[PDB]
């Protein structure tokens, strides 16, 4: 994205001298609902499913908010030994259909 920055050069003696210091001020409030920037193209969440003290499930949600482009992601998970995992129960679903990973 094209971004504009204001630069304060502290080595310039026009900016900072012995007789005058620097205090920068900035006016900003939460913008109205309209004119707010769009959400990023990628974000994710993680949670635990079930109840009790015997069995459960670990779930992750991945979002693609781009209008027309698909892109790949690489996912890394580490789990302690006490939570024993069953790999024949692993499922990946997009839009109600099964998604087959290229590498695992």
């Amino acid at each position: 994205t094209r971004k504009t920055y204001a630069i304060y050069d502290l080595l310039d003696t026009a900016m900072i001298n012995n007789s005058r210091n620097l205090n920068i001020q900035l006016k900003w409030k939460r913008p109205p609902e309209n004119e707010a920037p769009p959400v990023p193209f990628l974000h994710a969440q993680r949670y635990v499913s079930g109840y009790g003290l015997q069995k459960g499930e670990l779930s992750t949600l991945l979002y693609n908010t781009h209008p027309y482009r698909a892109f790949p992601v690489l996912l890394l998970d580490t789990v302690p030994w006490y939570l024993r995992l069953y790999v024949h129960t692993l499922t990946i679903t997009s839009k109600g259909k099964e998604n087959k990973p290229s590498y695992i």
């Binding site: 015997q54 030994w81 069953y86 790999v87 024949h88």
Partner: protein
């Protein structure tokens, strides 16, 4: 004849009815019914690990023998039929073994009578043919209609196959074949370790059937014992 078939039909019907209900998933996860060495979910986990290129024994979840892997590799689709077949098999083996044993018992008890080694007033302790008629059918019914066995069957626990192997060991022993007896005892020891303790009773029964005396200064006893032990260990 008809009673045994009727018992089998009722047992199979109850198992088939319970396989289709909404309690199968609840039953399959009881800690009283499955173990780290019996669960069906560990079977499917090991089979999946083999298809991911990982050794099934490189983790901490799968503790089954390779023969189970082979069998269920070829029969994963027909799983629910296998357990019904195995339960019927163990029931039938017990039935026929008990028939033969009762014959031996009555014949042995009858032989003592003429050697008059029993006390004068001991009657109503004597076995009679009318009371031993329905013992085998009962034995089959007690195995098949026990709630423990039905629970084990619906959960698809591996313990059923072990029970079948033990029952076949008993059947082959009472029928008098030592080679098959040693084979089945070896297959039972391969699956679980503890059945090796049943070596002594079967050897004693075989020796008694041969009419060989059991003494420290006997020759037939030692030869028979050596042959039986060699067959078992080789198996």
């Amino acid at each position: 004849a008809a009673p045994l078939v009727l018992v089998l039909v009722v047992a199979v019907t109850v198992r088939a009815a319970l396989f289709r209900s909404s309690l199968a998933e609840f039953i399959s996860e009881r800690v009283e019914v499955v173990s780290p060495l019996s669960s069906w979910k560990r079977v499917v986990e090991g089979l999946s690990l083999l298809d991911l290129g990982v050794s099934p024994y490189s983790g901490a979840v799968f503790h089954e023998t390779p023969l189970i892997i082979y069998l269920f590799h070829f029969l994963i689709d027909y799983a629910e039929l296998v357990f019904m077949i195995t339960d019927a098999l163990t029931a039938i083996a017990l039935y026929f073994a008990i028939q033969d044993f009762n014959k031996v018992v009555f014949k042995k008890q009858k032989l003592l009578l003429e050697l008059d080694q029993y006390a004068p007033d001991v009657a109503e302790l004597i076995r009679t043919p009318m009371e031993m008629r329905y013992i085998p059918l009962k034995v089959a019914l007690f195995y098949l209609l026990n709630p423990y066995t039905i629970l084990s069957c619906v959960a698809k626990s591996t313990c059923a196959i072990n029970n079948t192997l033990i029952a076949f060991f008993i059947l082959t022993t009472i029928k008098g074949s030592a080679f098959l007896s040693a084979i089945f005892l070896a297959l039972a020891t391969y699956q679980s370790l503890y059945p090796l303790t049943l070596f002594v009773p079967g050897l004693l029964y075989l020796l008694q059937r041969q009419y060989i005396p059991v003494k420290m200064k006997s020759k037939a006893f030692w030869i028979f014992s050596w042959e039986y032990a060699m067959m078992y260990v080789g198996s």
